Write a protein that binds this ligand. Structure first.
Ligand SMILES: O=C1CC(c2ccccc2)=Nc2c(-c3ccccc3)c(C(F)(F)F)nn21
Length: 273
């Protein structure tokens, strides 16, 4: 599928952070757009670490999956650039960046109706993926991007998009999956081949907890061994102090995967608030 983009049409600018075996940059893509018009377009650039180029297949598959669907709550993929040892994904630049950092910076002016709207949008995206039997596999607030802020004065809601999952937990080292507790569900800790649609219901619950906790990271105080034992003892997350969504979080984070609710049922629960 992927449009091949020339290295010379890509400029790398500021470093924005990192993902698993990747570095993330803002950049600019020079392109011919619709009517033959030349454009300099802001792009989000993800670079697979040279030392991990043996994961390149899973790195690109994560984006290819998303790019074969179109949906207003999914980030657009523009193409790839493979410059010898560099494996580069080129994607839409989303103005206000990651939800997790946005929640922390603005936690004092984000109320329950803003959280509810964002949860509803995320659920709409996940229902779309579920209807298409497409597993995401890394739903978390870091991977949700805010394209538009709420505008009180015009009643405009915030608007979010979900980015691609990155390299799959089916191929990642077990130590990384343990650090990713409690977004990674207990059955995938047992066996990463247990990755299924029910995975995304668990992770959606962890992500709602983030949205409700002002950007805190659940269980961050626990090292990997205690995270593993958290699953062994079958604990649940503490209610967010803003507890309106606590019941939904706990229903999604069901240790029995087959009992986790459909995204249709999840949306019905959200709309009754
Ligand atoms: O489009 C954007 C825009 C963006 C951004 C960052 C800082 C200020 C304004 C926007 N930050 C990101 C990330 C990102 C995620 C985790 C750590 C660092 C950056 C992603 C990604 F695709 F990687 F999810 N897209 N994105």
């Amino acid at each position: 599928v992927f449009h091949k983009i020339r290295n010379e049409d890509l400029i790398f600018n500021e470093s924005l952070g990192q993902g698993t075996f990747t570095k993330i940059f803002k950049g600019v893509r020079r392109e011919v757009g619709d009517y033959g018009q030349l454009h300099e377009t802001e792009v989000l650039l993800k670079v697979l670490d040279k030392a991990h180029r043996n994961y390149s297949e899973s790195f690109f598959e994560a984006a290819s999956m998303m790019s074969k669907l179109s949906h207003k709550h999914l980030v657009l993929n523009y193409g790839v650039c493979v410059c010898g040892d560099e494996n580069i994904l080129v994607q839409e630049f989303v103005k206000f960046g990651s939800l997790d950092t946005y929640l922390k910076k603005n936690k004092n002016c984000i109320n329950i109706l803003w959280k509810l709207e964002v949860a509803k949008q995320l659920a709409a995206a996940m229902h779309f993926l579920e209807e298409n039997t497409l597993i995401h596999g890394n739903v978390c607030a870091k991977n949700i991007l805010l394209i538009r802020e709420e505008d009180r004065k015009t009643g405009n809601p915030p608007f979010i998009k979900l980015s691609d999952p990155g390299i799959s937990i089916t191929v990642l080292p077990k130590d990384i999956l343990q650090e990713r507790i409690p977004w990674v569900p207990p059955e995938c800790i047992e066996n990463p081949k247990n990755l299924n649609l029910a995975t995304d219901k668990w992770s959606f619950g962890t992500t709602l907890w983030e949205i409700c906790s002002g950007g805190d990271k659940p269980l961050s105080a626990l090292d990997s061994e205690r995270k593993l034992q958290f699953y062994e003892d079958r604990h649940q997350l503490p209610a967010p102090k803003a507890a309106e969504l606590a019941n939904l979080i706990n229903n999604c984070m069901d240790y029995e995967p087959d009992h986790r609710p459909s995204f249709r049922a999840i949306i019905r629960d959200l709309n009754s608030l």
